[PDB]
Design a protein around this ligand. Sequence first.
Ligand SMILES: C[C@H](CCCC(C)(C)O)[C@H]1CC[C@@H]2/C(=C\C=C3C[C@@H](O)C[C@H](O)C3)CCC[C@@]21C
Length: 254
Amino acid sequence: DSLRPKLSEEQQRIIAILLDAHHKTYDPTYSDFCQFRPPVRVNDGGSVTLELSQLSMLPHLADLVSYSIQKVIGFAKMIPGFRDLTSEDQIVLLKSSAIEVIMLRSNESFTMDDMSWTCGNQDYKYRVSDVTKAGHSLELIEPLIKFQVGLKKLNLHEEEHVLLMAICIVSPDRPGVQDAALIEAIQDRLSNTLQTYIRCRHPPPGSHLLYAKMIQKLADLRSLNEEHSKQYRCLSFQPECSMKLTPLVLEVFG
Ligand SMILES: C[C@H](CCCC(C)(C)O)[C@H]1CC[C@@H]2/C(=C\C=C3C[C@@H](O)C[C@H](O)C3)CCC[C@@]21C
């Protein structure tokens, strides 16, 4: 059997639209980052109390996340079909997917040279110790780095990378969606574009089985999101935490 259908004119269009959507909303130069409140890295050596006391990298990482949520919304608006949903569902989907899409999309600055996100030079190079200094614990960070490496190693084409983001976002099992059929319809259209792409275009050899691995990463993103939730709740109990966040971050993770 081994059937290999040609991508349809429409599928191609979808891929074009998504590549362009991404390039419009992902500055590979990180040129805006000098506009965020400053990275502050005063050493905890090995401490939760200090890290909560200071939260030194929270202003900087929360501006980075607030900014990225903005670009995500932007990206989501150009996904073919997104606009056909009601704004009520559009927002439900943006809200519940934001943290996951940031994680996926942060794969583009992630480097296996030293397991960091290099945005970068020194000041915009983010390591595990920076994430701890923004008040997160190892139970989110370590599965996150593992997630970044797993994803890197999939060596996705940009096409697969932007399809995966679109699919993560337009998900019919988000708690609180109204019109699940429509969202599924939009997702199936992307998944099918992705499944076909992989068979049409992906080396590697012998596998259309990369599709399976991609879906596994979506499941992974679910767990990281739950863990992020619980660590965000905790963060939010630090007095004056709200000042170190932004309106958009509070509303999206509230
Ligand atoms: C868990 C957190 C986020 C949540 C932090 C709060 C809100 C306090 O809970 C991490 C996810 C990955 C991210 C990192 C980079 C991300 C990039 C850099 C660029 O790729 C451009 C992307 O759009 C975005 C590394 C540092 C840690 C992070 C911020």
